[PDB]
Structure 1
Amino acid sequence: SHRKFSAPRHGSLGFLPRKRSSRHRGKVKSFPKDDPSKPVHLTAFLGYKAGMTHIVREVDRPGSKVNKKEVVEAVTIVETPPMVVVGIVGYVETPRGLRTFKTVFAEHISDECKRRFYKNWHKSKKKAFTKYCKKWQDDAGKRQLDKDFSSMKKYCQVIRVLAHTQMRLLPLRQKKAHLMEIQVNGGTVAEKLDWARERLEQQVPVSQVFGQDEMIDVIGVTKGKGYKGVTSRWHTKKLPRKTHRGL
């Protein structure tokens, strides 16, 4: 037969490897298109959701019914202790997409970031980059650094800075810093690369990265609710409450 009535399909098939996300941190799959029509500035930034709260403002929509009157809105308090930036990665482009050309870590990186390379801080010697460090302290290493930055200035044409948050300033149980790249939109790769070079290993504020009264996007892994049924997951009507083995 034909479905004797027409109703919208339940759910959305455009989200349908529906499963646990392998990432635990919202993994930016995109970035605003690069453009030399601006001096450089970072474009992504990490915050923590603590809870909502009210707000009261006099709305400004000209000509609308509620214009110039008071309203209340429900805002969500994401707090973001300032991040540090500890590494610079270069991308090149090939007919098959991009390629992670090379990376350069900082001279010294804090334990919060070293803690991201390990599984048993208690059972381990915390020995990362203990050899890499001398590529900052021996002149030969500095020459190799020069070669690396010359290459990343010439061939690479998308540059991203490794950054992380520092848990130490934060009342969360955790002590393992969350690490993310940030892509640097702005003028030529020379300006991008040298500028981020100079900005290695310094605190990154918030108001620098994001403007005021802006319009940003939030990426995260939603709330989880366990292996769940089929009238709550896709919102399908319960069969009348006299059926057999299921309803």
Structure 2
Amino acid sequence: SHRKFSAPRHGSLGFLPRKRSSRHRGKVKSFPKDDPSKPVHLTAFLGYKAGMTHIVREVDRPGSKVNKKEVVEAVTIVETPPMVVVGIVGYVETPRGLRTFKTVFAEHISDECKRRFYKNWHKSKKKAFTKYCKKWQDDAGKRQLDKDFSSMKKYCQVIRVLAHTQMRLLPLRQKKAHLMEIQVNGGTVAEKLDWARERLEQQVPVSQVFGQDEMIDVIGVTKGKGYKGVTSRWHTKKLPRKTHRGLRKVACIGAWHPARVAFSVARAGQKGYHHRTEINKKIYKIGQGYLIKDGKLIKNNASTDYDLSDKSINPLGGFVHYGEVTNDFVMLKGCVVGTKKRVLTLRKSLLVQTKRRALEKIDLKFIDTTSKFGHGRFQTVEEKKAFMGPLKKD
């Protein structure tokens, strides 16, 4: 018989199966559709979730209750040291879909990238690309590369660059770089290859990919949470306290007929560590990394037009469980998937951004840099010392 009172089902069947992701680094499932009339540009990037904070800005929203007024907004800090292009991969459109046509690699590949090619770097002899790299040094090999580059011009329709991160500049334990294809959108196929060929072994800073006030998508793997029951995995109603044999369950997992449990019924199992794509996360700031100019370390990348204090984005005591952000970073509005240190794929939007929220221009008045390791109450150590005064340590 029909269920007495209507109610929406718990959870979305569009995110099934609720299993551990097969990839740790978020995969770009769909790159932006190429527009041949735009200049050659890259469409994605890799960053690492440093941590969260909040900022003060004045909203510019005509007809809104917060028009001309200051608001406090949470933001996620993603460290984005420049990537290094090391290879090109070309694709051919076939009636069975894009097929990898040809891959070319640069002559020199840093050991961070090579670590990606091994399961035990300690035990290996580091022989990767030791014989390929010779193709760039002899006339017979060189004449074979430009033919490979010429073939990719005749036949390939999609061009991507194999860029990798620079793990030596991060505060992390890992030394193995994250390597990913990035589609080269823009001009003709020939213009894509000349642009990509010129940038082999070169560095591509995040600013060259993304801009201020741009809406982007973050792709990553959520925080794993292990085996979970239906109450926590699916958010079903807890049964009454009197229930015998447990109340953190779904009471009826199906009807007599069909004589099977259906795929649409909440069950226990893995929670978290799911691949997810989130869209429309606005870029609030592309902060510049530390520079040594005239013997001085310039690090006031957390200063604003309305706050001239020389402080970095790092909070007192550093980003908890992450470290210190000393490279370029992207300040995203809101929260993103993953743990601290999680590698996050930054991708340009697949949509046309014509909305007041999407077009709004961000102007920061303040960036909170108090300690997150507790209830921090000082923005800077200079401010803390001036308030507290001398201590017994002094």
TM-score category, normalised to shorter length: over 0.9
Deviation readout 1:195-241 (Å, 9 max, x if unpaired): 11011110111111111110000000000101011101100111100
Provide the residue aligned with 1:69 in structure 2: 69
Deviation readout 1:153-206 (Å, 9 max, x if unpaired): 110000000000010011000000000011011010010011110111101111
Q: C-alpha displacement at 1:47, in angstroms?
A: 0.3
Query: Is the partner of 1:133 in helix, strand or coil?
Result: helix
Deviation readout 1:126-176 (Å, 9 max, x if unpaired): 110111111000111111011101110110000000000010011000000
Q: C-alpha displacement at 1:110, in angstroms?
A: 0.3
For 1:64 and 1:244, how far apart are their aligned partners in 2? 53
Deviation readout 1:110-138 (Å, 9 max, x if unpaired): 00000000011111101101111110001
Q: C-alpha displacement at 1:17, in angstroms?
A: 1.2
Q: C-alpha displacement at 1:50, in angstroms?
A: 1.1
4+ residue runs of structure 1 moved beyond 4 angstroms?
none
Deviation readout 1:66-108 (Å, 9 max, x if unpaired): 1000101000001111110000000001000010001000101
Deviation readout 1:33-64 (Å, 9 max, x if unpaired): 01111110000000000110010000001111
For 1:65 and 1:97, how far apart are their aligned partners in 2? 50
Query: Is the partner of 1:147 in helix, strand or coil?
Result: helix
For 1:228 and 1:29, how far apart are their aligned partners in 2? 28
Query: Is the partner of 2:57 in helix, strand or coil?
Result: strand
For 2:37 and 2:76, how far apart are their aligned partners in 1? 33
For 1:150 and 1:122, how far apart are their aligned partners in 2? 39
Kindly report the root-mean-square deviation, in angstroms, between the aligned alpha carbons of the 2 structures. Answer: 0.6
For 1:112 and 1:198, how far apart are their aligned partners in 2? 21
Query: Is the partner of 2:40 in helix, strand or coil?
Result: coil
Structure with greater strand share of residues: 2
For 2:162 and 2:66, how far apart are their aligned partners in 1? 45
Provide the residue aligned with 2:330 in structure 1: none
Provide the residue aligned with 2:34 in structure 1: 34
For 2:66 and 2:137, how far apart are their aligned partners in 1? 64
Query: Is the partner of 2:56 in helix, strand or coil?
Result: strand
Give the number of equivalent residue pairs: 246
- Percent identity over the alignment is 100
For 2:195 and 2:119, how far apart are their aligned partners in 1? 34
Q: Which runs of 5+ in 1 are unaligned?
A: none
For 1:138 and 1:10, how far apart are their aligned partners in 2? 64
Provide the residue aligned with 2:168 in structure 1: 168
Query: Is the partner of 2:233 in helix, strand or coil?
Result: coil
Provide the residue aligned with 1:48 in structure 2: 48
For 2:223 and 2:92, how far apart are their aligned partners in 1? 36
For 1:129 and 1:243, how far apart are their aligned partners in 2? 64
Provide TM-score, normalisation by structure 2.
0.62
Alignment pair present for 1:99 and 2:73: no
For 2:12 and 2:35, how far apart are their aligned partners in 1? 35
Q: C-alpha displacement at 1:18, in angstroms?
A: 1.1
Query: Is the partner of 2:116 in helix, strand or coil?
Result: helix
Query: Is the partner of 2:207 in helix, strand or coil?
Result: coil
For 1:27 and 1:190, how far apart are their aligned partners in 2? 26
Q: Which runs of 5+ in 2 are unaligned?
A: 247-394
Provide TM-score, normalisation by structure 1.
0.99
For 1:150 and 1:210, how far apart are their aligned partners in 2? 30
Query: Is the partner of 2:142 in helix, strand or coil?
Result: helix
For 2:144 and 2:133, how far apart are their aligned partners in 1? 13
Provide the residue aligned with 1:7 in structure 2: 7
Query: Is the partner of 2:245 in helix, strand or coil?
Result: coil
For 1:34 and 1:54, how far apart are their aligned partners in 2? 35
Provide the residue aligned with 2:302 in structure 1: none
For 1:206 and 1:153, how far apart are their aligned partners in 2? 27
Query: Is the partner of 1:217 in helix, strand or coil?
Result: strand
Query: Is the partner of 2:219 in helix, strand or coil?
Result: coil
Query: Is the partner of 2:228 in helix, strand or coil?
Result: coil
